[PDB]
Amino acid sequence: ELTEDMEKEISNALGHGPQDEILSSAFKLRITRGDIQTLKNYHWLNDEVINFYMNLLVERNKKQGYPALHVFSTFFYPKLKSGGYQAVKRWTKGVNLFEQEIILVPIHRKVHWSLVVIDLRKKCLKYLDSMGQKGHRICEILLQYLQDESKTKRNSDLNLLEWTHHSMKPHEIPQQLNGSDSGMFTCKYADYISRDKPITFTQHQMPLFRKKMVWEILHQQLL
Amino acid sequence: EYIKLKVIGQDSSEIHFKVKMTTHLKKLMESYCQRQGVPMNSLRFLWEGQRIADNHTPKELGMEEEDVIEVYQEQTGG
Secondary structure (H helix, E strand, O other), X not given: OOOHHHHHHHHHHHOOOOOOOEEEEEOOEEEEHHHHHHHOOOOOEEHHHHHXXXXXXXXXXXXXXXXXXXXXXXXXHHHHHHHHHHHHOHHHOOOOHHHOOEEEEEEOOOOOOEEEEEEOOOOEEEEEOOOOOOOXXXXXXXXXXXXXXXXXXXXXXXXXXXXXXXXOOOOXXXXXXXXXXXXXXXXXXXXXXXXXXXXXXXXXXXXXXXXXXXXXXXOOOOO | OOEXXXXXXXXXXXXXXXXXXXXXXXXXHHHHHHHHOOOOOOEEEEEOOEEOOOOOXXXXXXXXXXXXXXXXEXXXXX
């Protein structure tokens, strides 16, 4: 599904050069070789790739008329757990979360990625973990956040009795089979979910997606 | 010489800067890393959520006097 030309780029990208060379600039992130190397097999992805990738989803949806998406920094959820609504109040500035259809929040549990899908249209919070763990209180925390934004930015209490959450169980969604691909599921879970698309994929697709992703980043485009 | 900024972080010292308004923020980001021991690729510098890059100008983002910059460390997960 890739070409020789594409496969070359990807190779020249994935090693051989200066740790710090700048490979792709956008969303005011500077993706450096060392970053891109995180996409190498079994390598764990650092925040830089997932932030960059998230942003590419937004620009993807925008060009194919997919649901309005808003994407949070991998840092957002630590900081809000750490020092509460008040810590992350400004983060959402030029933006009204509530005119958006989908909110993706990537969770960085310890040495491990997850995702929360906040679906405004369904008034629902979906936690996904490729490693099968429950997102119960990740969830309560974030909803509480929306209450706070709704109150603070819109001046409107939220109707918390209409809001549901459910964290997806090991059998409901695709699990990982190596100890390295979570950040790739986190990313691919985002992608399908942001297109209203049922999750057809499996771990076995993930190495291509890996190889594929570094293309996506370089060319700032999705396939 | 236009503006005061505080730069804080987790396992990182508080350090006040005195940056010019149209000076690129790379210097700020770099001097801070030095003073820390830490490598330049090692931290991310957030202003009010948004990522500062090297070229960015305190004018260009409309930083304000005593605005705080925020320091987070690279995160990896498997």
